[PDB]
Design brief:
- Two copies of one chain form a homodimer.
- Chain A is of the alpha/beta class.
- Chain A contains seven helices and six strands, in the order βααβαβαβααββα.
- In chain A, 44% of the residues are buried.
- The complex binds magnesium ion (2 copies).
- One magnesium ion (MG) binds next to loops of chain A.
- It is classed as biosynthetic protein.
C-alpha cells in the first residue's frame, strides 16, 4: 500500500549526459510524474518522496535551490491530481518554498484517493532533537502514540525504493517503520524505466516479512 | 573501524539441519566467537552486535530465552578477551539476564583495544521514548551532541553487515549513523565463512561515501 521513493543520481546523471544540474533535476521532475502514474496504476495509495535530507541542505546554494525548485515544480503541475502534504526539518528550508508549498497543499485535491507527501531535511537526529525541544517539560511522558503523531513520516511505510547505486539509507530511514522493505537499484534516478519499477515491486512483493516474530 | 553485525537466520538454520533452535543458537555463538576473531584481524576496534530487537522479545518465551542464553554464553566464555558493554530497551529483558550481563561487564577487560557491545531490544521508537522520558524537564534543550551521548549505539557506525537473506533493517537502524554502509548477505548466520566476511569488508571498504554533500 505505502511506498517511499528515495530518488537519487541527478548530479551524476547530469555530468554523464553533459547537461546542467537544473536539466538533471527537470528530468527528475518529469520522471517523478511518470513514476507516480506507475504507482497509482499498481495500487499505491500513499507515496512519500524524500525531497531532501538535512545534509543535502548543506550543499551549495545553487544545488539546494535546484532540488527545491524541481520538487516544487512537480507540485505546481500535478497538485489537482492528488492530496499533497509535506513535513520534516522545515527550519532548514527557505521561507519562499514553505509559503509556496503551503499554498499548493491548500490548492491540492483534499478529496483524492492518492496521497503524495514530501519529506524535507530528513534526518532522525534532527527529527528527535526537534520533537524533544517542542515537548520538553510540557507533557508528563513520551509514548509510542505521541511519537507517531510527531514523526516526520506520519504513517507506516511498507516499501522503500532507493536509486542511485548506493546501498545505505542516507538519513532517510523512517522512524516508525522498522520493518520497511528496501529495494536498492543501481540506476541513476532519471534513467529509471517501468521495467525497473516492475522489477522493484516484484522483489518487494515476494519478500517474506516477519516483523521480528516467528511464522507459526 | 566501527562495525555492526546483525546476525540473522538461526531458526531457518535449525530447520535446515533438523536441529533444535537451541542448537542453532549454539552454532551462532560459536560463529560469533570466530567472527570476532576475523574482525580483530581486519582492524575492527568496536564491534556492535544486535542481540535483539524490541519485537524479538515478543517471540514465544522459549524462543526469547534461547537467544538470550546463547548471546549471554558467548560473553561467559569470552569476556576476558575484550571490553564488554550492552544497551537498549533493557526494560524488555528479564532481570536474570540483565544481572548476569552486568556482572560479566564488570569481569571483562576494561583495558582492551577491542570492544564488543550488545544492543538488546533495539528499536528507534523505544529508544526515543526512553531518551525523552529520562531527560524530560531535566535539561534546558536537546542538541545533536546530547542525543549521541544517550543513544543506544554510543558511537558512529561505519559499516553494517546483515545476514539472513533479508534486505531490510528490521528495527536495527543506528539512530546517529545516517550514512552507515549496508551490506546484505543471503547466508544464514551460522554458515558464515571467512570468505563471506572478506567479501563483505571488500564491498563496504570500496563504497563511495558522500554524507549528503557534493564533491568540491
Ligand atoms: Mg546522491
Ligand atoms: Mg530472522
Amino acid at each position: 500500500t505505502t511506498l517511499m521513493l528515495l530518488p537519487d543520481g541527478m548530479r551524476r546523471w547530469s555530468e554523464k549526459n553533459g547537461v546542467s544540474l537544473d536539466d538533471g533535476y527537470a528530468a527528475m521532475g518529469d520522471k517523478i510524474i511518470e513514476f507516480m502514474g506507475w504507482a497509482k496504476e499498481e495500487g499505491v495509495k500513499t507515496l512519500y518522496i524524500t525531497a531532501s535530507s538535512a545534509a543535502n541542505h548543506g550543499r551549495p546554494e545553487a544545488a539546494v535551490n535546484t532540488f527545491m525548485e524541481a520538487f516544487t515544480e512537480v507540485i505546481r503541475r500535478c497538485h489537482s491530481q492528488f492530496k499533497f502534504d509535506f513535513s520534516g526539518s522545515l527550519d532548514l528550508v527557505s521561507e519562499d518554498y514553505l509559503t509556496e508549498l503551503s499554498a499548493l497543499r491548500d490548492k491540492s485535491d483534499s478529496e483524492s484517493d492518492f496521497t503524495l507527501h514530501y519529506i524535507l531535511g530528513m534526518s532522525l537526529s534532527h527529527e528527535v532533537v526537534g520533537i524533544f525541544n517542542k515537548l520538553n517539560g510540557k507533557i508528563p511522558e513520551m509514548t509510542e502514540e505521541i511519537l507517531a503523531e510527531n514523526a516526520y513520516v506520519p504513517t507506516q511505510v511498507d516499501y522503500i525504493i532507493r536509486t542511485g547505486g548506493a546501498i545505505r539509507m542516507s538519513s532517510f530511514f523512517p522512524l516508525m517503520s522498522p520493518y520497511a522493505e528496501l529495494h536498492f537499484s543501481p540506476v541513476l534516478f532519471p534513467d529509471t524505466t517501468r521495467a525497473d519499477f516492475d522489477a522493484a515491486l516484484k522483489d518487494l512483493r515476494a519478500r517474506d516479512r516477519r516483523f521480528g516474530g516467528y511464522p507459526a
